[PDB]
Design an enzyme around this catalytic site. Structure first.
Site, PDB file in Angstrom:
ATOM      1  N   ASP D  57      -4.715 -21.555  12.496  1.00 49.48           N
ATOM      2  CA  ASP D  57      -5.862 -22.122  13.187  1.00 49.48           C
ATOM      3  C   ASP D  57      -7.025 -22.312  12.224  1.00 49.48           C
ATOM      4  O   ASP D  57      -7.297 -21.458  11.377  1.00 49.48           O
ATOM      5  CB  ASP D  57      -6.271 -21.216  14.348  1.00 49.48           C
ATOM      6  CG  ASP D  57      -7.228 -21.890  15.307  1.00 49.48           C
ATOM      7  OD1 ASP D  57      -7.231 -23.137  15.367  1.00 49.48           O
ATOM      8  OD2 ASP D  57      -7.966 -21.172  16.013  1.00 49.48           O
ATOM      9  N   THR D  90      -9.995 -28.015  15.441  1.00 47.59           N
ATOM     10  CA  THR D  90     -10.877 -27.249  14.571  1.00 47.59           C
ATOM     11  C   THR D  90     -10.650 -27.536  13.094  1.00 47.59           C
ATOM     12  O   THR D  90     -11.504 -27.199  12.269  1.00 47.59           O
ATOM     13  CB  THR D  90     -10.700 -25.753  14.827  1.00 47.59           C
ATOM     14  OG1 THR D  90      -9.352 -25.374  14.529  1.00 47.59           O
ATOM     15  CG2 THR D  90     -11.003 -25.423  16.275  1.00 47.59           C
ATOM     16  N   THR D  91      -9.526 -28.158  12.742  1.00 51.63           N
ATOM     17  CA  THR D  91      -9.221 -28.497  11.357  1.00 51.63           C
ATOM     18  C   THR D  91      -9.623 -29.923  11.010  1.00 51.63           C
ATOM     19  O   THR D  91     -10.182 -30.164   9.936  1.00 51.63           O
ATOM     20  CB  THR D  91      -7.728 -28.305  11.082  1.00 51.63           C
ATOM     21  OG1 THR D  91      -7.337 -26.977  11.450  1.00 51.63           O
ATOM     22  CG2 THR D  91      -7.410 -28.545   9.624  1.00 51.63           C
ATOM     23  N   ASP D 388      -4.570 -22.487  22.942  1.00 52.48           N
ATOM     24  CA  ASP D 388      -4.743 -23.880  22.553  1.00 52.48           C
ATOM     25  C   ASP D 388      -3.992 -24.803  23.502  1.00 52.48           C
ATOM     26  O   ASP D 388      -4.432 -25.933  23.743  1.00 52.48           O
ATOM     27  CB  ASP D 388      -4.296 -24.051  21.094  1.00 52.48           C
ATOM     28  CG  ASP D 388      -4.175 -25.507  20.650  1.00 52.48           C
ATOM     29  OD1 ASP D 388      -4.691 -25.817  19.557  1.00 52.48           O
ATOM     30  OD2 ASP D 388      -3.513 -26.327  21.316  1.00 52.48           O
TER      31      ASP D 388
HETATM   32  N1  LIG Z   1       4.872 -34.974  14.684  1.00 51.78           N
HETATM   33  C1  LIG Z   1       3.713 -35.398  14.130  1.00 51.78           C
HETATM   34  N2  LIG Z   1       3.692 -36.435  13.268  1.00 51.78           N
HETATM   35  C2  LIG Z   1       2.549 -36.867  12.711  1.00 51.78           C
HETATM   36  N3  LIG Z   1       1.348 -36.318  12.957  1.00 51.78           N
HETATM   37  C3  LIG Z   1       1.222 -35.270  13.803  1.00 51.78           C
HETATM   38  C4  LIG Z   1       2.427 -34.741  14.450  1.00 51.78           C
HETATM   39  N4  LIG Z   1       2.026 -33.720  15.227  1.00 51.78           N
HETATM   40  C5  LIG Z   1       0.681 -33.604  15.088  1.00 51.78           C
HETATM   41  N5  LIG Z   1       0.203 -34.528  14.239  1.00 51.78           N
HETATM   42  C6  LIG Z   1      -1.216 -34.703  13.844  1.00 51.78           C
HETATM   43  O1  LIG Z   1      -1.808 -33.459  13.471  1.00 51.78           O
HETATM   44  C7  LIG Z   1      -3.209 -33.512  13.741  1.00 51.78           C
HETATM   45  C8  LIG Z   1      -3.724 -32.165  14.230  1.00 51.78           C
HETATM   46  O2  LIG Z   1      -3.240 -31.118  13.395  1.00 51.78           O
HETATM   47  P1  LIG Z   1      -3.553 -29.568  13.700  1.00 51.78           P
HETATM   48  O3  LIG Z   1      -4.139 -28.924  12.471  1.00 51.78           O
HETATM   49  O4  LIG Z   1      -2.311 -28.979  14.310  1.00 51.78           O
HETATM   50  O5  LIG Z   1      -4.672 -29.547  14.858  1.00 51.78           O
HETATM   51  P2  LIG Z   1      -6.227 -29.886  14.619  1.00 51.78           P
HETATM   52  O6  LIG Z   1      -6.333 -30.265  13.167  1.00 51.78           O
HETATM   53  O7  LIG Z   1      -6.485 -31.044  15.549  1.00 51.78           O
HETATM   54  O8  LIG Z   1      -6.913 -28.595  14.988  1.00 51.78           O
HETATM   55  C9  LIG Z   1      -3.410 -34.592  14.788  1.00 51.78           C
HETATM   56  O9  LIG Z   1      -4.317 -35.575  14.289  1.00 51.78           O
HETATM   57  C10 LIG Z   1      -2.053 -35.228  14.993  1.00 51.78           C
HETATM   58  O10 LIG Z   1      -2.165 -36.648  14.926  1.00 51.78           O
HETATM   59 MG   LIG Z   2      -4.200 -28.891  16.775  1.00 50.78          MG
END
Ligand SMILES: Nc1ncnc2c1ncn2[C@@H]1O[C@H](COP(=O)(O)OP(=O)(O)O)[C@@H](O)[C@H]1O
Ligand SMILES: [Mg+2]
Ligand SMILES: Nc1ncnc2c1ncn2[C@@H]1O[C@H](COP(=O)(O)OP(=O)(O)O)[C@@H](O)[C@H]1O
Ligand SMILES: [Mg+2]
Ligand SMILES: [Mg+2]
Lengths: 535, 180, 60, 523
Positions: D57, D90-91, D388
């Site tokens: 996270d 959050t990332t 989440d």
């Molecule tokens: N199977 C996948 N293929 C390509 N991109 C993905 C896939 N699953 C998630 N993502 C991308 O990962 C990003 C989010 O990554 P994550 O670090 O898990 O959450 P966040 O950064 O939003 O907190 C989103 O922009 C989404 O488009």
């Molecule tokens: Mg995410």
């Protein structure tokens, strides 16, 4: 030293006159980069790591530790402007420190210090009379266009500068709602009566104006309803806990049989008091004190809300706006305790909303009067704290315009006009006061110099043109509308500040002249310092 | 308040307290309700004696050993359109009596409509944000006292402005003692 | 004048400057009590009485 | 002597501060950028107590770091503003803010005033919102197989993705139960009533959502029953024992029978209270206070089961799942506040520890989530991922809008602003295209993290969006090829995207308005 054993030190002559000025000019050099629409902010970090971001002069100087006696006078001067007026806290320090600097060149010559002070008092007196010639009455122009522009001008040079056209409508719509009615001699507009609440979250364009009152409180028990349509407000000022005897009253039991009845009567006195309140139809109960958990159950089956530990300053505004009466006891003109139904409030929607995890209680559509409250939305805690301070400065600007129906053009159009009138006025004195008045004219010209410098523009031709335009406004009466130009920092040319919409209340510039001259006099008359050693 | 009747008080309005150490003993459930009821009729009795005289402004002297004004007495006093002013020092009673001409009252049986000092206006002023102030003007029986308010921008200017006025009072004093 | 506690007072009275100073010579600690007397009866001229007393002792 | 003016106050100003604030923000992004996408790696921390926080996270990592620079402290705080507002994202809010703040120093070194860049950033933020609301696609709430795909695309990045068929049905069946309407038209989904209990042991496949509440308590007396079929539970708040008052009471006794008569009244007081409860015929008594030993004697005579010292919050969720209300004085006991909404009450042993189960409820409005696993560290990361998954589901019901994910949305808005900047003129055009081209960092981190050429895949995606209908084409994060998001099935709620774009612009605006630091003033 030799003689005069005082167990300290002393400085006399030009040593202390040229040291009281380098201490005054340094304080003015801190806030010289935070003036006008092209000024930036500052960051303040203490020893623990509490970050404060601001540009207003009253907050930077207040948080700084200053111990030179000639510099602390300027710090207390800024705190006076924020209370009397509320705006122009950094514009007044620059004038005051420049006035001393122009007075050193005279005192270092063979000009007596009393001749400078006498000339300064004359220039300050005539500079206020001329301003009243340069006055604009708002009622001739559109009422709702002389307040949006006047409030938006105070919004520039802040974090909410671009969002002025959105925040200007909110400020005007929040002042007109709390317009108090006098004995019909003059409307009264109280300030610091709106509640400004900070809550980080969505963008700053998501701030809403509540048509009512907002409370930073939560309902007591989870069993109570959180939405009442037709609510009957009953404001209280006493705790609904179990009764007990005072310090002077004790309980002595000689018969064991009369013990149960006494213990039962401690929880029965408070039960009867609540029933007297709920029988009139009360829906919402607001208490400044605390409510026992046993007394929170009577509001559950009754379908009523009870909010505990409410501030006294908040209860005063809720009671006033809804028609309720704040009572500190249930007694009446006789010995009994009663609760009539002619002293409740009336709202039309009491809903407990949720905003970014934590909750709050809104009170909407109060029928007795009108009330306002502002909820600010920003990125984090640092950003929201700068939107509150920059919104307070805007509320005080609108209040002065409504109270004093007169505004003056902004953007350096006044100081450039005053440096012309004072120059030809000193030519009719023919004394050593001629030099003093001419220095007042040159000292006022520092506002445009610090506006064209912060904008990365040429500050020589721009101010040369300003003096050339205003010189044609005094002579040649066929050209008398040239006194409303000022300065523009977006392009770099003198525009029409009258038509553009740059305005300022006249009480800001009048007060800043009187405060900046009296502070320069008291510093100027000092020819000796004795500093005693600490014990 | 307009056309006010000022009155000085030196006794307190709270629960009855004697100089000797006293206490109230309760040994029955029926006596608990009487303590509250009989207490409430004691404060109400004293407030109804003040309104009989026709008083508008009240001046309470400072007391430290016992409470000078309880929340119950203030609740009754507001309902009768009377201004209450608390925390008056014991050193400036004479200057108050010399200005408005107010007989001090130290016992309830001596609160008569002659123990009162009249006035024209008695209202509080509100400054630009520096605080509030009380002005009582137009006294029916003025004395030989006067007061001056000094205004300044800094704490240093006020002190020097005050010493300058005190110098202009000593020069006028010198002229009456030796007219030369 | 700045006190050692951190108190600053801009004054001009001759009876105030001599009070705020902390002198240690016994012959000058008697000049402070001289200006105090003039402030009590006359109320003015506290600066003049120190110059006169400081010029007569010199002529001796 | 030693005279000063500002008491050893450290002041810095000029262009040195502006380059110091940007480089402090870019360093924060450099720590986190490897934890984005389904191929993300894992970190561990070391808290001052001694534990270990191993997670993916973005907020659980930056909140444990102590940094002394003031400009870095603002990037730590905006991480938790996203966490408390939407839960997810959050990332992406930290990487995007760094890129939006790195492309600004290029203009500041070209003799451009910082206030000019502010108006360009705020102008372009009002065009990002209008473009996202144009490509939004509505969702149907009554469709249950669609609500499983939205949650699955949000936990396909965490360490739960191995059991995505299980955590999808856990975070869906809990939000649908909490939703409730008490008075008026106020609809609330509050996650305070979704208690999560972690128990070390067993296997992760035993994680289920009970139809009630689970308490860690036991019966006071061993002779009490431990299995009731249809209980009528009554909830209390007061204590069932004799206590003292507060009115300074004393007793004076001078006869021979006044001592034993006083002691006899303490037992008649307890019997009076108990007979007010047996009158309503409960089965189980729940109280938040203590129970005396005598009061337990009168409750086993009527076959009543009692639990002593239940937490306030555990005693609030029971009223939401069985149906009752908290009563303090047992004299005001009615029939409408007796809980008849349960269907089971058993007390088991889970690894040498008793547990109270209240399951089989008619229509519960509060539940508990029972997690089993390997250690306390593993179960801690499961809880962070489930919190989440429920915050994503709650946002859909409050705003049924979806947008393509995987990087298709970043190029969709990047295309729209590049074709709108060519109709403007002046000096505001150049910071207008840096804000549009800074958004390509989201689909650029998805190529580096999997392993592929980021200079051939990016230019094959930019030219892919030049066509009129290609707004859904993104980059596959598992293989490294451009696929349509209509078949892959990657979607995200509109509320998450609107908060990532709005927070990042204001962080860039706030940090571009500083030009001096005053360090050290002792409050
Ligand atoms: N199977 C996948 N293929 C390509 N991109 C993905 C896939 N699953 C998630 N993502 C991308 O990962 C990003 C989010 O990554 P994550 O670090 O898990 O959450 P966040 O950064 O939003 O907190 C989103 O922009 C989404 O488009
Ligand atoms: Mg995410
Ligand atoms: N839009 C504007 N154009 C030109 N000058 C302005 C504008 N807004 C404010 N000013 C000028 O900036 C000066 C300083 O105001 P500011 O920097 O906001 O701090 P303060 O109001 O405390 O002096 C004012 O004298 C005002 O005339
Ligand atoms: Mg201003
Ligand atoms: Mg004199």
């Amino acid at each position: 030293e030799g003689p005069l054993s005082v167990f300290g030190d002393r400085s006399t002559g030009e040593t202390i006159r040229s040291q009281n000025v380098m201490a005054a000019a340094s304080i003015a050099n801190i806030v010289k980069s935070s003036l006008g629409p092209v000024g930036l902010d500052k960051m303040l970090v203490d020893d623990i790591g509490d970050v404060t971001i601001t540009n207003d002069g009253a907050t930077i100087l207040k948080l700084l530790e200053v111990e030179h006696p000639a510099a602390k006078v300027l710090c207390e001067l800024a705190d006076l402007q924020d209370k009397e007026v509320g705006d122009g806290t950094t514009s007044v320090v620059i004038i005051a420190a420049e006035l001393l600097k122009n007075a050193d060149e005279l005192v270092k010559q063979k000009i007596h210090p009393t001749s400078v002070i006498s000339g300064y008092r004359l220039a300050c007196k005539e500079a206020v009379r001329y301003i009243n010639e340069n006055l604009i009455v708002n009622t001739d122009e559109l009422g709702r266009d002389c307040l949006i522009n006047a409030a938006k001008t105070s919004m520039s040079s802040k974090i909410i500068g671009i969002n002025g056209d959105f925040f200007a409508n909110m400020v005007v719509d929040a002042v007109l709602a709390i317009k108090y009615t006098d004995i019909r001699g003059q409307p009264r507009y109280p300030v610091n009566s709106v509640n400004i609440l900070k809550a980080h979250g969505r963008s700053q364009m998501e701030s809403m104006l509540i048509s009512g009152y907002a409370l930073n409180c939560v309902v007591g028990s989870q069993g109570m309803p959180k939405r009442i349509v037709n609510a009957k407000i009953a404001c209280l000022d006493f705790s609904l806990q179990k009764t007990k005897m005072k310090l002077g009253v004790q309980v002595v039991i000689t018969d064991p049989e009369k013990l149960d009845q006494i213990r039962q009567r401690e929880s029965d006195i408070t039960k009867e008091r609540i029933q007297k309140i709920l029988a009139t139809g009360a829906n919402v109960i607001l208490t400044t004190g605390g409510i026992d958990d046993m007394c929170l159950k009577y509001f559950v089956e009754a379908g009523a809300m009870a909010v505990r530990r409410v501030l006294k300053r908040d209860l005063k505004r809720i009671a006033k706006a809804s028609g309720a009466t704040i009572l500190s006891t249930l007694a009446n003109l006789e010995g009994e305790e009663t609760f009539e139904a002619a002293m409740l409030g009336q709202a039309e929607e009491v809903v407990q909303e949720r905003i970014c995890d934590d909750e709050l209680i809104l009170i909407k559509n109060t029928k007795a009067r009108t009330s306002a409250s502002i909820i600010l939305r920003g990125a984090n805690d640092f950003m929201c704290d700068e939107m509150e301070r920059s919104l307070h400065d805007a509320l005080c600007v609108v209040k002065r315009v409504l109270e004093s129906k007169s505004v003056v053009p902004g953007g350096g159009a006044v100081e450039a006009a005053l440096s012309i009138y004072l120059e030809n006025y000193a030519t009719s004195m023919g004394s050593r006061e001629q030099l003093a008045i001419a220095e007042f004219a040159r000292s006022l010209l520092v506002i445009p110099n610090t506006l064209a410098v912060n904008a990365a523009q040429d500050s020589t031709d721009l101010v040369a043109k300003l003096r050339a335009f205003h010189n044609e406004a005094q002579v040649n009466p066929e050209r008398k509308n040239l006194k409303w130009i000022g300065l523009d920092l977006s392009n770099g040319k003198p525009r029409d500040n009258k038509q553009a919409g740059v305005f300022e209340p006249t009480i800001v510039k009048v007060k800043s002249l009187k405060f900046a001259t009296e502070a320069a006099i008291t510093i100027l008359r000092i020819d000796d310092l004795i500093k005693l050693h600490p014990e | 308040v307009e056309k006010a009747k000022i009155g000085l008080i030196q006794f307190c309005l709270s629960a009855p307290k004697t100089d000797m150490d006293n206490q109230i003993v309760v040994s029955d459930y029926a006596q608990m309700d009487r303590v509250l009821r009989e207490e409430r009729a004691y404060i109400l009795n004293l407030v109804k004696q003040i309104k009989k005289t026709g008083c508008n402004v009240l001046l309470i002297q400072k007391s430290i050993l016992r409470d000078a004004l309880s929340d119950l007495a203030l609740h009754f006093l507001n309902k009768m359109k009377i201004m209450v002013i608390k925390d008056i020092e014991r050193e400036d009673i004479e200057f108050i009596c010399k200005t408005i001409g107010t007989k001090p009252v130290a016992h309830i049986d001596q609160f008569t409509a002659d123990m009162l000092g009249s006035a024209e206006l008695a209202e509080e002023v509100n400054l630009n944000g520096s605080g509030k102030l009380l002005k009582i003007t137009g006294c029916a029986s003025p004395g030989k006292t006067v007061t001056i308010v000094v205004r300044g921008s800094n704490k240093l200017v006020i002190e020097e402005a005050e010493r300058s006025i005190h110098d202009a009072l000593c020069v006028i004093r010198c002229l009456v003692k030796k007219r030369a | 004048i700045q006190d050692g506690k951190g108190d600053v007072t801009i004054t001009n009275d001759g009876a105030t400057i001599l009070k705020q100073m902390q002198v240690l010579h016994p012959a000058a600690r008697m000049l402070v009590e001289l200006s105090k007397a003039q402030d009590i009866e006359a109320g003015d001229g506290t600066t003049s009485v120190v110059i006169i007393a400081g010029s007569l002792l010199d002529s001796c | 002597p030693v005279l000063v003016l500002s008491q050893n106050t450290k002041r810095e100003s000029g262009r040195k501060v502006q380059s110091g604030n940007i480089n402090a923000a870019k360093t924060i992004a450099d720590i986190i950028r490897t934890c984005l996408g389904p191929k993300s790696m894992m970190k561990m921390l070391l808290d001052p107590m001694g534990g270990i926080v191993m997670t993916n996270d973005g907020n659980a990592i930056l909140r444990e770091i102590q940094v002394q620079h003031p400009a870095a402290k603002s990037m730590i705080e905006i991480s938790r503003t996203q966490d408390e507002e939407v839960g997810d994202g959050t990332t992406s809010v930290i990487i995007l803010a760094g890129e939006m703040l790195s492309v600004a120093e290029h203009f500041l070194e070209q003799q451009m005033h910082p206030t000019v860049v502010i108006s360009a950033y705020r102008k372009a933020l009002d065009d990002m919102i209008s473009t996202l609301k144009k490509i939004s696609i509505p969702v149907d709430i009554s469709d249950s197989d669609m609500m499983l795909n939205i949650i699955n695309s949000s936990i396909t990045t965490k360490a739960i993705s191995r059991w995505s068929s299980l955590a999808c049905n856990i975070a869906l069946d809990a939000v649908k139960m909490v939703q409730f309407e008490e008075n008026g038209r106020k609809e609330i989904d509050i996650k305070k009533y979704a208690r999560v209990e972690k128990i070390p042991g067993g296997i992760i496949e035993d994680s289920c959502v009970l139809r009630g509440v689970m308490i860690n308590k036991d019966v006071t007396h061993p002779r009490m029953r431990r299995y009731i079929k249809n209980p009528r539970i009554v909830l209390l708040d007061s204590s069932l024992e004799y206590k003292k008052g507060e009115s300074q009471t004393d007793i004076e006794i001078t006869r021979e029978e006044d001592f034993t008569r006083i002691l006899q009244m303490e037992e008649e007081y307890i019997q009076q209270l108990c007979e007010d409860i047996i009158q309503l015929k409960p089965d189980v008594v729940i109280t938040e206070k203590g129970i005396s030993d005598l009061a337990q004697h009168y409750l086993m005579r009527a076959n009543i089961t009692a639990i002593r010292r239940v937490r306030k919050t555990d005693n609030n969720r029971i009223a939401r799942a069985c149906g009752a209300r908290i009563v303090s004085r047992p004299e005001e006991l009615r029939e409408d506040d007796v809980g008849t909404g349960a269907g089971l009450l058993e007390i088991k042993k889970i690894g040498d520890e008793y547990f109270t189960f209240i399951t089989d409820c008619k229509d519960p409005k509060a539940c508990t989530i029972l997690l089993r696993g390997a250690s306390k560290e593993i179960l801690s990361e499961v809880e962070r991922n489930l919190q989440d998954a429920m915050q994503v589901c709650r946002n859909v019901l409050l705003d049924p809008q979806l947008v393509p994910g995987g990087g298709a949305s970043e190029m969709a808005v990047a295309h729209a602003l590049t074709e709108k900047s060519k109709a403007m003129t002046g000096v505001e055009q150049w910071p207008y295209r840096a804000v549009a081209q800074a958004l390509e960092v989201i689909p650029r981190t998805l190529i580096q993290n999997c392993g592929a050429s980021t200079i051939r895949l990016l230019t094959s995606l930019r030219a892919k969006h030049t066509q009129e209908n290609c707004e859904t084409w993104g980059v596959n994060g598992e293989t490294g090829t451009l696929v349509d998001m209509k078949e892959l099935g990657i979607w995200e709620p509109l509320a998450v995207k609107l908060q990532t774009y709005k927070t990042a612009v204001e962080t860039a605006v706030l940090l571009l308005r500083i030009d001096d630091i005053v360090s050290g003033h002792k409050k």
